[PDB]
Amino acid sequence: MLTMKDIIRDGHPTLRQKAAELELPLTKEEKETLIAMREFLVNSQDEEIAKRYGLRSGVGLAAPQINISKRMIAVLIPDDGSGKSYDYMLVNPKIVSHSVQEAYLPTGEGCLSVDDNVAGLVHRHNRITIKAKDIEGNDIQLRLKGYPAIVFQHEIDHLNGVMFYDHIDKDHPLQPHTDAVEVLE
Numbered sequence: 001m002l003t004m005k006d007i008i009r010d011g012h013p014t015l016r017q018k019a020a021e022l023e024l025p026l027t028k029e030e031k032e033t034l035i036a037m038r039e040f041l042v043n044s045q046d047e048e049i050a051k052r053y054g055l056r057s058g059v060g061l062a063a064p065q066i067n068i069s070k071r072m073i074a075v076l077i078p079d080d081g082s083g084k085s086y087d088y089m090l091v092n093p094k095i096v097s098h099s100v101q102e103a104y105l106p107t108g109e110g111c112l113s114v115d116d117n118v119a120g121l122v123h124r125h126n127r128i129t130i131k132a133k134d135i136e137g138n139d140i141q142l143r144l145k146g147y148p149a150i151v152f153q154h155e156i157d158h159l160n161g162v163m164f165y166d167h168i169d170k171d172h173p174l175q176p177h178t179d180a181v182e183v184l185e
């Protein structure tokens with residue numbers, strides 16, 4: 001069972017490397033890793049388990065964040081109210097197209113690997129199309145908009161050694177770009 005002790009923190013070299021593409025099929029160990037990544041997210045969202053193991057609640061996890069420099073991510077976004085929910089373990093995910101129009105969470109973003117909150121808007125594409133493999137090497141193509149698009153972009157960033165605060169404007173951290181879409185958490 002993964003817990004916070006498995007999450008490496010900002011400053012660790014692995015978070016700034018470019019993660020390696022997976023060979024398909026995955027090894028048993030790689031499959032177990034990705035399953036445990038998803039399981040971390042599940043536990044972090046269970047009030048009781050999270051309390052018992054001091055888990056910070058999360059909706060996304062990238063393998064580099066547990067010091068595994070591989071292009072695997074997990075995303076677990078529970079139902080918001082619209083009936084839409086996201087439960088994906090992706091191998092070699094790639095953004096193949098996206099909107100010109102941007103979006104941002106009005107609070108900025110946070111990160112499991114980052115202890116202190118960083119104020120500032122993180123502009124991302126409002127819509128994206130992702131191609132990936134699943135855990136069994138089958139094909140997945142996702143069309144995502146708004147909140148889940150933001151989360152996936154955040155996770156994919158980790159695989160290229162990019163941190164959310166890299167996107168924050170130094171001089172005007174809280175000024176939205178013209179026409180950018182405010183996304184409700």
Ligand SMILES: CCCC[C@H](CN(O)C=O)C(=O)[C@@H](NC(=O)Nc1ccc(C)cn1)C(C)C
Pocket residue numbers: 045056057058059060061062065078109110111112113150151154155158
């Ligand atoms: C936008 C990218 C977020 C990635 C980041 C983990 N990460 O470091 C990933 O690489 C999170 O998951 C944030 N926490 C979060 O979202 N908590 C949350 C929010 C809503 C619901 C319903 C439950 N839990 C962090 C601020 C911890």
Ligand SMILES: [Zn+2]
Pocket residue numbers: 110111112113154158
């Ligand atoms: Zn993160």
